[PDB]
TrEMBL record, chains A, B:
It comes from the Bacteria. SUPFAM superfamilies: GroES-like (SSF50129), NAD(P)-binding Rossmann-fold domains (SSF51735). It comes from Methylorubrum extorquens (strain ATCC 14718 / DSM 1338 / JCM 2805 / NCIMB 9133 / AM1) (Methylobacterium extorquens). NADP(+) binds at residues 214, 216-217, 237, 241, 256, 325, 352, 395. Keywords: Metal-binding, NADP, Nucleotide-binding. Mg(2+) binds at residues 70-71. This is Crotonyl-CoA carboxylase/reductase.
Length: 428, 428
């Protein structure tokens, strides 16, 4: 409430960073929406509209959005593949965006934890709140679970978005709006992988193979390991990337381009299967050269999938886990039953994270023990462009972000957004 | 000690069931041994020799063998594939057999738990006893772990075998010698699968898909489920087998021959992949018809491998585990990454079991809550024949057994073995 009266008048439509009086809610807002006939490339399917501000219920909340995050799923949405969201919800239009920072503007009748004017970031997991798994087990195992901004169109690429109370976490005051908004989805996901599957969690001492260490997922495996006592073993495909990952806490690096052990699992007992095992073993020593010899990784941290899995299942210690949330290079997974059963290795699928997980992760960032690693930030009018950049992989390592009501890069407080000035949302 | 003096004199070689005085150990014994040049079909590679009785150490024990069990591994040994045991141990010859019932005849200097004349059955797991995993963790994760009678040639197809104290469990007085000796290896294995991988263990209420329900492994999944409150869902390939498995506790049956969803995973997005999912779904309802609808199995209990895995990974509930110890139909495992990561399913390899596991299992049998299911029993001179029968799958459902010092089928006590009479070990 330092800035309660330096605001604007009560009206039904504001421009970017034109702060309304606290708790006043305009009939309308500006947004980046998708409709079923637009479906296609981000610059084609994401177009700019003026829509009504979301109606909210008993346990929901409304957020004035300062910045947001760019993730792959916003592309799958604009694409309508692998599926269209309109085959998931009954909506006429869809507002994407699954990461965010901003202010709470209005709360439901039953909301006590959070209060109007509180500064927050947003976790993307939602459920109906009332079955066995959401009340005693793991809420990610409820059929009711879904991802906000993907399987819902009340996402964050708009002046306002609608979220459940159970999606809100406190914002780190030490970050810019854009930094606060880039990491939660990707950080929380990686946190579930490494701490959310007892008894195969990370402990001081362990060695963890991290695939694609420069990726949005990669950078967070590396940091979380280091920040906990463990020893991340990064993997990359460009030697200019070496310094980067190593300044993060990495305890070694390796480059996949040196080998050929890539591709599905050669049918067994065939020479290819024998030439395959030959190089892959080279890959194995590559670790021991870092880890010491006889020292296989406690956890493989997977996501490329089809092309590497055969290998990942080989290098993991007896009693070790190979966890993963994607298959960026194919889904025909393959592996040699012999290796995982004799050495009793766990192959564990994983998928985002839940509030208590996202918020344990958020704490590492609040204590400054982990850093969002924001790759770069685009402005409100470049949002579809920002997505196109991910599409064909031309983005820099780390996590992109885009601006909303925050009118310029580098802004931290709401006072900063005011004095920097309102901005036209729809000009051309 | 009811029969301490109805024995024979002190000599250095006895015939079958010619009981020596308690604690007297003959210089020599009769056995079924393998040597590297014999390698081949069981009837070729298992030949009959007279060898010295094993020397034993501080924590080891010597057992007078009444009956033993027949398992696949005795065939892989005689075969010398996938490997020869002589590439594992430095021995000139090898005595196979990984299951057994009998009397303790001699104990090491440091053996307090067990005493001479005690009646026992044998678990096949061994380790060196002195690293981290054997002293605080799971001893199956020690590099020192190995299977007795396979990776060692002091097995049970002989008048005497040598075992570690940590392999011994008490024998159920209510069984015949052969019954007591058929089940431990196969029972314990299945017990680890269903109770040895927290937090995905069996609980009253759960539904568990059991592949090959008539198999030595199958029958024990079914019984253990039922005996615990769960609901085994058997799978078979002969309708004459239906009554069998259902009298065991099964709560339903299904027959794989009706479908075609068998084989590796059709490359994705291809019509075959679409026709594949079509039948497999039929397979899924087949369950709900038994389980109720919306009710996916908590645990798939796998072992056929390559040909079914694609399917097994589909039918398991979100948060469910697919555990397995074999790949009897290939090792090029395959599955759709999408299914296991979104529904966060665990794919867990497993391999035999450890003492505390084998002995929890043994308790079910001691309370008469589980039954060995002995398929049939061959005599001492048919042991290689018994193995040949497994080789090409012509054995009846359940678990085979063969006789040693027990001179006739149906004998229970040692008194019974005496009055039934000694028997010539080597006649032709
Ligand atoms: N379903 C979920 O729960 C969930 C949540 C978040 C993200 N994801 C997924 O996880 C994936 C990546 O996330 P991200 O933030 O890391 O995106 P990203 O920044 O594009 O990550 C790509 C990184 O992976 C590495 N990589 C790409 N292909 C590789 C290959 N063939 N072999 C080895 N490394 C390879 C690259 O690093 P190098 O070439 O230097 O090794 C690259 O830096 C995407 O599929 C995304 O959808 C899934
Ligand atoms: N490494 C370990 O820890 C360990 C320990 C013990 C056993 N094993 C292994 O487990 C396997 C079987 O053990 P077992 O005692 O059950 O031997 P088994 O008695 O021969 O089991 C075979 C059973 O599996 C079923 N089956 C065979 N092919 C099938 C297929 N293509 N699809 C569906 N079902 C099929 C059959 O039943 P239906 O045709 O009626 O369905 C048959 O009754 C072997 O590979 C054995 O080596 C491994
Ligand atoms: Mg991002
Ligand atoms: Mg058997």
């Amino acid at each position: 409430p330092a800035w309660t009266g330096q605001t604007a008048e009560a009206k039904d439509l504001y421009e970017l960073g034109e702060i309304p009086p606290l708790g006043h809610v305009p009939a309308k807002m500006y947004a980046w929406a998708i409709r079923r006939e637009r479906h296609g490339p981000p610059e084609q399917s994401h177009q700019l509209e003026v829509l009504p501000v979301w109606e909210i219920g008993d346990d929901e909340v409304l957020v004035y959005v300062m910045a947001a995050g760019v993730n792959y799923n916003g592309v799958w949405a604009g694409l309508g593949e692998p599926i269209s969201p309109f085959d998931v919800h009954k909506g006429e239009y869809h507002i994407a965006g699954s990461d965010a920072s901003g202010i709470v503007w209005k709360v439901g009748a039953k909301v006590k934890r959070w209060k109007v004017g509180d500064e927050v970031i947003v976790h993307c997991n939602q459920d109906d709140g009332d079955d066995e798994e959401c009340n005693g087990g793991d809420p990610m195992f409820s059929p009711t679970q879904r991802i906000w901004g993907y399987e819902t169109g009340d996402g964050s690429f708009a002046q306002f978005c609608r979220v459940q109370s159970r999606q809100l976490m406190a914002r780190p005051k030490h970050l810019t709006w854009e930094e606060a908004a880039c990491y939660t989805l990707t950080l929380a996901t990686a946190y579930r992988m490494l701490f959310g599957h007892a008894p195969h969690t990370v402990r001081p001492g362990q060695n963890v193979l991290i695939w694609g260490a420069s990726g949005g997922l990669g950078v967070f495996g590396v940091q979380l390991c280091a920040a906990s006592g463990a020893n991340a073993i990064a993997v990359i495909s460009d030697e200019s990337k070496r310094d980067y990952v190593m300044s993060l806490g990495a305890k070694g690096v390796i480059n996949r381009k040196d080998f050929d052990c890539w591709g599905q699992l050669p049918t067994v007992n065939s020479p290819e299967y024998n030439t395959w095992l030959k190089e892959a073993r080279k890959f194995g020593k590559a670790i021991w050269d870092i880890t010491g010899k006889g020292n296989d990784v406690d956890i493989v941290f997977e996501h490329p999938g089809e092309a590497t899995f055969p290998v990942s299942t080989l290098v993991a210690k007896r009693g070790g886990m190979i966890v993963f949330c994607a298959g960026t290079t194919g889904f025909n997974i393959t592996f040699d039953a012999r290796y995982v059963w004799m050495r009793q290795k766990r192959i564990q699928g994983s998928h985002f994270a839940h509030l208590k997980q996202a918020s344990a992760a958020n704490q590492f960032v609040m204590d400054r023990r982990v850093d969002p690693c924001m790759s770069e930030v685009f402005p409100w009018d470049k949002i579809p462009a920002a997505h196109t950049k991910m599409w064909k992989n031309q983005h820099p390592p780390g996590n992109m972000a885009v601006l909303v009501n925050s009118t310029r890069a580098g802004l931290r407080t709401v006072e900063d957004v005011i004095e920097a000035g309102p901005l036209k949302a729809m000009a051309a």
